[PDB]
């Protein structure tokens, strides 16, 4: 517990001070005594005590940026999936052992206190979590970086499983308050909606608007032991200052802008409220940017002092908004303003799936943001003039590249707007960034090849190793010291220990400890028992057809059927865990969750199977749960159809935490296998080239059904009601999709998947060799530190040099 | 400034500690430095520093009540008009001089900082402010007392005057946070709405309800230098824990219950939302009461340990709610439960005006609170059985006394419910309590004479003398010491100084200082100039026909016309100030405000008048403004039609602060004149007997018009458009009401009022004799301390003995 050296020192005066301040907060802040005080009160007492340690560095860091005047990095995102903050703050400030000792002396278990904290679940999954890892890495790399987003009152819904179905409940994360944020009502700014354009004497003027106020809440973002504390600023919607009762109640309408995170992360829903959220962040943020620029030492120097990073197209309105401010308010000529805008803005693309692309109807933009639509049209005209000059007579190219899409509903393609208005465009993994240049944005790449870049995603080894897996962090540090924590490529040193008996022992010991603890978690919180002597086979990620939880389902049923066919034949015991939230309006994803639980209903109660195979659906998968289950995982399921997962980041988390990966050559899986050597990955299935070949001739699921007896059995089980005896036709939609409308070719990878899984089991039967392959994975996970990713953004896009230098 | 002894000591270590903690809060709490810190930041730094001094006493006081186990007093009100808290806290903790010195040493003006604080304007006027004074007095008298109400997100609207008209804006009092309250989300309770009654095995059961959560916020209530800190608990509406987006947005509906204070304090608006607010407070509060009772040592002892005071009929649902809990949940027999309920509950009545009485349609109660309606009917049946037994054959009495009113819309008379369910019923001034027994509740008085009491209202001499008028507080203390501050009857000692040259000098000096300061306030905040050498003639109170701002208007115009008729004739210069908010839906009150400003538009710009007469409308009259204008007042206008103002409390504030009173024999005016001697009051107009005689024969305004040339002139000025030349018919509604539909007989008191005002001017011409009469008023204001009022409630209704004893 305290023996772990990576968790810092418990200095005698530090422990004494922490105890004093803990008690001070319990009294003055919480207004409690030890008589009535609950564990929650004790959590808050510790939270306030720890938060106090950020203040000096937070003030000094921001003062330092004012004095040193570096280029400022503005990271705009509609999602920040931050998780809990208590442990992270302690780790980054080297206070973990000290607080652990302080709380122990007060008769309290700090780990019990940590479990009281709610996730800041202000994101859906990978994209939101990437933003969070990026904030962490930017602070650790000493960048003058500012995360900007919306302070949703309700984050991603809490998932309940009831009767085997997902139920959504409001994530009331602010119920007991947020001790980490600092409300800044004094820095509230006006955001304008609707209205009309007057073109007059000085030029265009946006008038008759409805105002929604944006109140900032600032949250400290500590770097790893470098005394740097950056800021995440999240905007909250407030009704403007100036019958009666109804008028006061109607203030809720404006304030609804920041009420709730949209949970659909796979399908573009052209909801006006989402458009308002996006403009809300953009308008308020850019006001801050402009104000700060003016208070630093004429807009020629703007791109030298400002970088705006667009996390997907969600904040794409930053482009016309910056143009609007520069042209209409600052009175710059269009050409100069555009030069400035392009040099300021860069765009990160996160998916190739067409249904996810933001394409706003022009009528909606005209009504809500009339001036922005005007500006977008002018941008388009000038951009297409450039295309026409570069490719004279290529009319189809003009049509393909246009920001305006011409159908029954005329729309603005926000990706096209982003490319046009950005000096850099990046994908999030090598395979993804390459397909961007090759197909998706081929025309844009040909126009401006220098624009297109790759920035392979990463994860922070603070949250995703030191916090969640201190036991693994410790055994690593015992061999190679602590430098790896902010220099993850040093993990390659561990390759020298592939034959080290002590290290093999310790890697395996740590995994088993994590497995026991997670088993203890499921027993404590859900009264669910799992076999500790089973392979922990884990697929955790949002529920999507492309991620192919359905393929996992087919395999699980295969394992079940094989046991039933040959009950005497030994098989490696497995606990198959699948978790993740479905978008509320995504019927198939909700059916998939029900299928997982239904498979469990049969498998988990078959006396012939017993503890040889168990299938569990992990309820309410979220950042805090990922921190628990990933360190306990033996097998990481990364089984998206080749070409569909832009990068993935869960994959990296598993690799860092001592799990072996079964996966397709998709997203960052490709680079993970390259880093480790393919011999150390369970790679299976179609490559992108194979998927394309199938698309060329037409995907016929019937062929696979007709040729694979074991698949046929499963589909007939699903259709006949074997997994839903009380409602035989329950899974008809799943069967129909698989047989006739499967965009993701589940059947096409079935045989290779099952055979690959056989090899997983074969290796697990050899504990020594399993662990040696694990060492080969952990040792080569260094590339997937978000420090590496951010250093690349800094040097290749932002034009700033990262620094691990400690502030005084 | 600091020289004022009543403001305490500036101890060297105390000043040092305050400065240290001020700086500590600026750093750790506000996350600011002296470079970016605003006056608002400095206010908050001081607020947190001062608030820290309450914590120990707050915890110890509540612990003391647990140990000593006294009878608990629960004061239920839909209104708490608290005002600002910073100065009050400092005064009650003897920290004012210390903080003044501390802030001075830091280079800050504490008075400038105090002006930053928003009023907690969670009330309309007198009733809400009475609750606030009561909380203060109960703490000062060492009572285990608990104020319970609703934490409105928006209090009484901020009043803007635009084009001479009232405009309403949301009172966003929580914009920058409330440093005084402590959120207690852990003690959140469920409140139930709608649903239906099941009568089953154990009995009745309220089922299928919609739940709204009640989250308590606790605010410290410091007693005057007795180390007692009581609690005001205000409930905030929260949506219960368990398409999707719309469902999250719809949480606003439940949360609207605590959104805004209903601003109509003169007309019963049977709004369902108001009914929900009333039940919301009642249900949550009574849950607290029951829980606390059970955690103290079977319901026979309930009335020995619990008193519930109903501030008017607004929390009247406490009666059927307590019955519901006792019968349905605690399983007591009806008779015993009723015995307990009556002994627990007492009712304070605040008006005789019929349109203000709460009479809820039975259909509305059946839908929202079906079980309560059932209980009300049973209460009524049993109560009327008692009436029938006491007055056999008196069928009309039964009809008159029934809780059920039988018209086209069947209604429950909430006053009748209160009388039936309470062991004590009190009016708020001797005249008012007497009319209750004589007419309004005559039948109830005859049934149970012992039930009916008087508790003449009062005001706290902390807020209303020591805080708002330290200069007057000081000159008093110089002669008689500081005991009077919590023993106001000691002011009678000042009668010994009616011929004391030094005291006459000082009383007059203090008044002039206050007048200069208020003149400075109007110049600073509104660029409005007032004549400092003029009589400050002030009518501040909510705008109602019964309060007769219109009568004041007639007098002002009379003064103007008299000047114009005889420009060479000296008149005592006057600044006539009228301020107060009109209920948004009260057309006549809004017209009256416009008339006041319109009169000013003419008078204030007539070169013949100049500074001899000025009429100003004081914008946004509220507690903080009352604290400024009342100490500056020379003449207090208390001119309600006899029988219409139940008590008044503004009257008392003026008397305490060195103003002479012009008023009718109405409400507490009668007792104020009795205390001081009528020779020291400007009493005029019809008594209640005269109003009744007019009602008997019929009020004909035409007679007064026909007989009074000067009145005729004014009405013709109003009708012809003299005060609205651009819209001649603007005031037609006012004229029509005065001439034909005046319930309050403005014309009937016109002649006596004008003649009484002549005598006011005559005395003001004699500064010595004015000041001597002032001394006679201040010296006899002691009865009107809310300490006296609360001591009476304690001894005569609650059965507890007050104590000025200091806690350790
Ligand atoms: C509205 C929305 C929300 C989330 C997402 C994504 C895209 C994605 O995960 N969530 O971004 C991650 C970070 O770059 C990638 O690792 C995932 O492959 C990608 O699907 C897209 C669109
Ligand atoms: C809904 C409502 C609100 C306020 C009031 C009152 C009644 C009143 O002022 N406001 O109570 C004061 C305190 O007892 C009295 O001094 C006033 O005379 C009375 O009008 C009645 C009803």
Which is nearest to B466 in space by CA: B141, B140, B218?
Answer: B140
Confirm if B631 and B472 have CB atoms less than 8 A apart. yes
Q: Cβ separation of B242 and A160 shorter than 8 Å?
A: yes
Question: What string of DSSP letters covers A596-615?
Answer: HHHHHHHHTT-TTTGGGEEE
* Residues comprising chain A, all counted: 808
> What is the bridge-based pairing of β-strands B635-638 and B613-618?
unpaired
Which residues numbered 572-591 in B keep a CB inside 8 Å of some CB on A? 584-585
Question: Beta partners for B216?
Answer: B235
CA of A19 to the centre of ligand 2 (A): 51
For residue B25, CA distances in Å to A215, B29, B382 come to 22, 5, 60
CB neighbourhood size of A538 (10 A):
24
Residues of A tagged active-site: 350, 541-542, 547, 649, 653
| DSSP 8-state symbol, B371 | H
Report d(CA B217, CA B291) in Å as an integer.
17
Report d(CA B652, CA B488) in Å as an integer.
13
Confirm if B127 and B134 have CB atoms less than 8 A apart. no
Instruction: Say how many CA atoms lie within 13 Å of B262 toward its Cβ.
Output: 18
Element (H, E) at A286: helix A272-294
Q: Cβ separation of A168 and B245 shorter than 8 Å?
A: no
Confirm if B131 and B123 have CB atoms less than 8 A apart. yes
Report d(CA A451, CA B237) in Å as an integer.
52
User: 3-class SS at B44?
Assistant: helix
Which H, E and C letters describe B429-442, residue by residue? CHHHHHHHHHHHCH
Residues of chain B contacting residue A176, judged by C-beta atoms under 8 Å apart? 185-186
Question: Beta partners for B614?
Answer: B575
User: 3-class SS at B278?
Assistant: helix
CA of B656 to the centre of ligand 2 (A): 20
Q: Cβ separation of B157 and A244 shorter than 8 Å?
A: yes
E-assigned strands of B305-361? Answer: 306-311, 345-348, 359-361
Contacts of the segment B597-601: beta carbons below 8 A, 24+ positions apart: B597/B161, B597/B164, B597/B165, B598/B164, B598/B723, B598/B724, B598/B730, B598/B731, B599/B553, B599/B556, B599/B557, B599/B560, B599/B723, B601/B164, B601/B723
For residue B50, CA distances in Å to A262, B44, B103, B571 come to 43, 10, 12, 49
Q: Which of B64, B84, B238, B350 is catalytic?
A: B350
Which residue in B has a C-alpha nearest to residue A219's C-alpha?
B31
User: 3-class SS at B199?
Assistant: strand
Which pair of structure tokens corresponds to residue B734?
Answer: 């006012």
CA angle at B805 for the pair B803 and B808, rounded to the nearest 5°: 140
Report d(CA B321, CA B327) in Å as an integer.
10
Residues ≥6 apart with Cβ < 8 Å to A606: A560, A564
CB neighbourhood size of B548 (10 A):
27
Pocket test for ligand 2, best of B80, B126, B268 (most atoms within 8 A of CB): B126
CB neighbour burial string for B216-237, b if at least 16 within 10 angstroms, e if fewer: bbbbbbbbbbbbbbbbbbbbbb
Report d(CA A352, CA A415) in Å as an integer.
11
Q: Is B520 an interface residue toward A (CB < 8 Å)?
A: no
Give the number of whichever ligand sits closest to the CA of residue A266: 1
Q: Cβ separation of B172 and A241 shorter than 8 Å?
A: yes
Report d(CA B456, CA B790) in Å as an integer.
10
* Residues comprising chain B, all counted: 808
User: 3-class SS at A108?
Assistant: coil
Confirm if B621 and B581 have CB atoms less than 8 A apart. yes
- Considering CB atoms only, which of A242, A259, A585 is closest to B248? A259
Confirm if A159 and A621 have CB atoms less than 8 A apart. yes
- Please classify residue B61 by burial: count the beta carbons closer than 10 Å to its beta carbon, then call 0-12 exposed, 13-18 middle and 19+ buried: buried
Which residues numbered 730-789 in B keep a CB inside 8 Å of some CB on A? none
Report d(CA B384, CA B382) in Å as an integer.
6
Which H, E and C letters describe A146-200, residue by residue? EEEEECCCECCCEEEEECCEEEEECCCCCCCCCCCCEECHHHCEEEEECCEEEEC
Q: Is B152 an interface residue toward A (CB < 8 Å)?
A: no
Is B219 among the catalytic positions? no
Element (H, E) at B477: helix B470-480
Question: What string of DSSP letters covers A319-338?
Answer: HHHHHHIIIIIS---HHHHH
Q: Cβ separation of B55 and A154 shorter than 8 Å?
A: no
Which is nearest to B419 in space by CA: B348, B350, B351, B369?
Answer: B348
- Helical residues (DSSP H) of B143-257, grouped into ranges: 244-249, 251-255
Which pair of structure tokens corresponds to residue A465?
Answer: 């190793």
Question: Beta partners for B152?
Answer: none
Question: Beta partners for A574?
Answer: A535, A613
Q: For residue A405, is it left (φ>0), alpha (ψ between -120 and 50) or beta?
A: beta
- Considering CB atoms only, which of A182, A248, A260 is closest to B245? A260
Q: How far is CA A53 from the centre of its chain?
A: 28
CATH code for residues B1-458+786-808 = 3.40.50.2000
Which residues numbered 644-703 in B keep a CB inside 8 Å of some CB on A? none
CB neighbourhood size of A49 (10 A):
25
Residues of chain A contacting residue B27, judged by C-beta atoms under 8 Å apart? 55-56, 59
User: 3-class SS at A785?
Assistant: strand
- Considering CB atoms only, which of B168, B182, B252 is closest to A244? B168
Which residue in A has a C-alpha nearest to residue B34's C-alpha?
A59
Q: How far is CA B50 from the centre of its chain?
A: 26
Report d(CA A444, CA B559) in Å as an integer.
83
Contacts of the segment A771-775: beta carbons below 8 A, 24+ positions apart: A771/A504, A771/A507, A771/A508, A772/A498, A772/A499, A772/A504, A773/A660, A773/A680, A774/A507, A774/A511, A774/A658, A774/A659, A774/A660, A775/A494, A775/A495, A775/A497, A775/A498, A775/A503, A775/A504, A775/A507
Report d(CA A74, CA A400) in Å as an integer.
31
CATH 3.40.50.2000 domain extents, chain B: 1-458+786-808, 459-785
Q: Is A58 an interface residue toward B (CB < 8 Å)?
A: yes
Which is nearest to B181 in space by CA: B219, B221, B150?
Answer: B219
Resolution of this PDB entry, in A? 1.8
Question: Beta partners for A662?
Answer: A637, A682
For residue B205, CA distances in Å to B220, B364, B665, B748 come to 37, 20, 52, 57
Q: Is the CB of B458 within 6 Å of ligand 2?
A: no
- Please classify residue B421 by burial: count the beta carbons closer than 10 Å to its beta carbon, then call 0-12 exposed, 13-18 middle and 19+ buried: buried
- Helical residues (DSSP H) of A495-548, grouped into ranges: 501-526
User: 3-class SS at A3?
Assistant: coil
Q: Is B42 an interface residue toward A (CB < 8 Å)?
A: no
Element (H, E) at A234: strand A229-238
Write down the number of H helices and E strands in chain A: 32, 25
Q: Which of B51, B233, B451, B542 is catalytic?
A: B542
Contacts of the segment B725-734: beta carbons below 8 A, 24+ positions apart: B730/B594, B730/B598, B731/B591, B731/B594, B731/B595, B731/B598, B733/B587, B733/B588, B733/B591, B734/B550, B734/B588, B734/B591, B734/B592, B734/B595
Residues ≥6 apart with Cβ < 8 Å to B769: B763
Give the number of whichever ligand sits closest to the CA of residue B278: 2
Instruction: Return the biggest CA–CA distance within chain A.
Output: 89
Confirm if B116 and B40 have CB atoms less than 8 A apart. yes
Report d(CA A348, CA A313) in Å as an integer.
8
Q: For residue B246, is it left (φ>0), alpha (ψ between -120 and 50) or beta?
A: alpha
Report d(CA A729, CA A184) in Å as an integer.
55
Q: How far is CA A12 from the centre of its chain?
A: 39
| DSSP 8-state symbol, B69 | -
> What is the bridge-based pairing of β-strands A574-579 and A613-618?
parallel
CB neighbour burial string for A580-603, b if at least 16 within 10 angstroms, e if fewer: bbbbbebeebbbbbbbbbbbbebb
Which residue in B has a C-alpha nearest to residue A31's C-alpha?
B55
Which is nearest to B313 in space by CA: B383, B413, B404?
Answer: B413
CB neighbourhood size of A192 (10 A):
16
Q: How far is CA A85 from the centre of its chain?
A: 16
Report d(CA A375, CA A378) in Å as an integer.
5
Residues ≥6 apart with Cβ < 8 Å to B353: B266, B546, B644
CB neighbourhood size of A112 (10 A):
12
Residues ≥6 apart with Cβ < 8 Å to B179: B44, B47, B48, B51
Which is nearest to B140 in space by CA: B456, B424, B463, B426?
Answer: B463
Q: Give the CATH fold of the A459-785 domain.
A: Rossmann fold (3.40.50)
CA of B645 to the centre of ligand 2 (A): 8
């Amino acid at each position: 517990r305290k023996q772990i050296s990576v968790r810092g020192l418990a200095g005698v005066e530090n422990v004494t001070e922490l105890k004093k301040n803990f008690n001070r907060h319990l009294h003055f802040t919480l207004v409690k005594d030890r008589n009535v005080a609950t564990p929650r009160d004790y959590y808050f007492a510790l939270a306030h005590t720890v938060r106090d340690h950020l203040v000096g560095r937070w003030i000094r860091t921001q003062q330092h940026y004012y004095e040193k005047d570096p280029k400022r990095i503005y990271y705009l995102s509609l999602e920040f999936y931050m998780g809990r903050t208590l442990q992270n703050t302690m780790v980054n400030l080297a206070l973990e052992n000290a607080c652990d000792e302080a709380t122990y002396q007060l008769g309290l278990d700090m780990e019990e206190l940590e479990e009281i904290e709610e996730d800041a679940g202000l994101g859906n999954g990978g994209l939101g979590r990437l933003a969070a890892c990026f904030l962490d890495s930017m602070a650790t790399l000493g960048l003058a970086a500012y995360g900007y987003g919306i302070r949703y009152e309700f984050g991603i819904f809490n998932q309940k499983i009831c009767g085997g179905w997902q139920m959504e409940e409001a994530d009331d994360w602010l119920r007991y308050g947020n001790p980490w944020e600092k409300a800044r009502p004094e820095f509230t700014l006006p955001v304008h909606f609707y209205g009309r354009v007057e073109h007059t004497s000085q030029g265009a003027k946006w008038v008759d608007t409805q105002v929604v106020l944006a109140m900032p809440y600032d949250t400290p973002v500590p770097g790893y032991r470098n005394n740097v504390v950056n800021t995440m600023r999240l905007w909250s919607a407030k009704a403007p200052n100036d019958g009666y009762i109804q008028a006061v109640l109607d203030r809720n309408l404006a304030e609804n802008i920041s009420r709730v995170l949209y949970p659909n992360d796979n399908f573009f829903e052209g909801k006006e409220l989402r458009l308002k959220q996006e403009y809300f962040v953009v308008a308020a943020t850019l006001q801050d940017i402009i104000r700060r620029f003016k208070s630093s030492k004429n807009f020629d120097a703007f791109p030298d002092k400002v970088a705006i990073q667009l996390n997907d197209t969600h904040p794409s309105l930053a482009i016309p908004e910056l143009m609007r401010v520069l042209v209409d308010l600052e009175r710059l000529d269009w050409d100069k303003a555009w030069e400035v805008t392009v040099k300021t803005c860069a765009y990160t693309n996160h998916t190739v799936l067409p249904e996810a692309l933001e394409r706003w109807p022009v009528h909606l933009l005209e009504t809500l943001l009339p001036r922005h639509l005007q500006i977008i049209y002018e941008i388009n005209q000038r951009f297409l003039n450039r295309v026409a000059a570069a490719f004279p007579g290529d009319v189809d190219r003009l049509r393909r590249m246009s920001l305006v899409e011409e159908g029954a509903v005329k729309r603005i393609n926000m990706a096209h707007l982003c490319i046009a208005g950005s000096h850099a465009v990046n994908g999030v993994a090598r395979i993804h960034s390459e397909i961007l240049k090759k197909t998706i944005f081929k025309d844009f790449y040909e126009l401006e090849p220098h624009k297109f870049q790759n920035k392979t995603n990463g994860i922070t080894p603070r949250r995703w190793l030191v916090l969640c897996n201190p036991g693994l962090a410790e055994i690593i540090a015992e061999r190679i010291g602590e430098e790896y924590i902010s220099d993850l490529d040093q993990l390659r040193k561990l390759l020298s220990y592939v034959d080290d008996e002590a290290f093999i022992r310790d890697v395996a010991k740590v995994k088993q400890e994590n497995k026991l603890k997670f088993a203890a978690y499921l027993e404590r919180e859900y009264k669910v028992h799992i076999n500790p002597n089973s392979l922990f086979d884990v697929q955790v990620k949002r529920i999507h057809e492309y991620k192919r939880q359905l393929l996992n389902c087919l395999h699980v049923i295969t394992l079940y059927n094989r046991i039933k066919k040959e009950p005497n034949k030994f098989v490696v015991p497995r606990t198959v865990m699948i978790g993740g939230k479905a978008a509320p309006g995504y019927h198939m994803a909700k059916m998939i969750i029900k299928l997982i639980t239904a498979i469990g209903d049969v498998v988990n109660h078959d006396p012939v199977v017993g503890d040889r195979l168990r299938v569990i659906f992990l309820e309410n998968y979220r950042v805090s749960l990922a921190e628990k289950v990933i360190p306990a995982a033996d097998l990481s399921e990364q089984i998206s159809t080749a070409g569909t997962e832009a990068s993935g980041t869960g994959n990296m988390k598993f690799m860092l935490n001592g799990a072996l990966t079964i996966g397709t050559m998709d997203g960052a899986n490709v680079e993970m296998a390259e880093e480790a050597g393919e011999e150390n990955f369970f790679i299976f299935g179609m490559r992108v080239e194979d998927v394309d070949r199938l698309d060329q001739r037409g995907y016929n699921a019937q062929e696979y059904y007709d040729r694979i007896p074991e698949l046929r059995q499963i589909i007939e089980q699903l259709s006949s009601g074997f997994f839903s005896p009380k409602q035989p036709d329950l899974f008809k939609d799943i069967v129909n999709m698989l047989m006739h409308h499967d965009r993701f070719k589940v059947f096409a990878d079935y045989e290779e998947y099952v055979k690959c899984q056989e090899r997983v089991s074969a290796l697990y039967k050899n504990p020594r060799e399993w662990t040696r392959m694990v060492i080969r994975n952990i040792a080569t996970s260094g590339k997937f530190s978000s420090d590496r990713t951010i250093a690349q953004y800094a040097r290749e896009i932002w034009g700033v040099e990262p620094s691990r230098q400690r502030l005084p």
